[PDB]
């Protein structure tokens, strides 16, 4: 499913993301934007290390979810990576909450550092009513 901006904003707020671990809703919006363009079925195979990024938040199969084909992987979120491709983003959100809880916080996603950190992220939530 390809989410419309404000639709995603409101949906994330309902799931308890605004301020989750100190990270504002606008930051979560910036991240989803650059990772998949609000696409729940987005996948990126990483040839260099045989891992795959799944879903709206592009969660990696080496540490967070299990797809069965990634060498020496962990399943920290305790979910099949298939769960991260559903139109309903409740599982992905739950796995995203687990990812930020780690030592780097939201900095865990390199895309965040490149396109969101130290920038004006207001534009991602303006007029959405959140």
Catalytic residue ranges = 35, 53
| Token pair listed for 79 | 């979910």
The two beta strands, 51-54 and 43-46, are: antiparallel
For residues 90 and 14, the answer to whether their CB atoms sit within 8 Å is no
Joined together, the tokens standing for residue 89 give: 């983003």
Task: Provide the token pair at 71.
Answer: 């060498």
Task: Give the C-alpha separation, 116 to 118, whole Å.
Answer: 6
């Amino acid at each position: 499913k390809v989410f419309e901006r404000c639709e995603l904003a409101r949906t994330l707020k309902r799931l308890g993301m605004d301020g989750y671990r100190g990270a504002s809703l606008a930051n979560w919006m910036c991240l989803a934007k650059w990772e998949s363009g609000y696409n729940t079925r987005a996948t990126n195979y990483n040839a260099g290390d045989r891992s795959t990024d799944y879903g709206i938040f592009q969660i990696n199969s080496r540490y967070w979810c299990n797809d069965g084909k990634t060498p020496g992987a962990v399943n920290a979120c305790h979910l099949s990576c298939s769960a991260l491709l559903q139109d309903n983003i409740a599982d992905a959100v739950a796995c995203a909450k687990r990812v930020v809880r780690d030592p780097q916080g939201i900095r865990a996603w390199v895309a965040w550092r490149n396109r969101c950190q130290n920038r004006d992220v207001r534009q991602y939530v303006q007029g959405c009513g959140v």
